[PDB]
Design goal:
Elements: no helix or strand
């Protein structure tokens, strides 16, 4: 983990958008 730039996908409690 770096101090600069923080992704959204970079959160274990957050899942990516999927369509089934």
């Amino acid at each position: 983990g770096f101090p600069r730039a923080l992704p959204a996908w970079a959160r274990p409690d957050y899942n990516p958008p999927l369509v089934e």
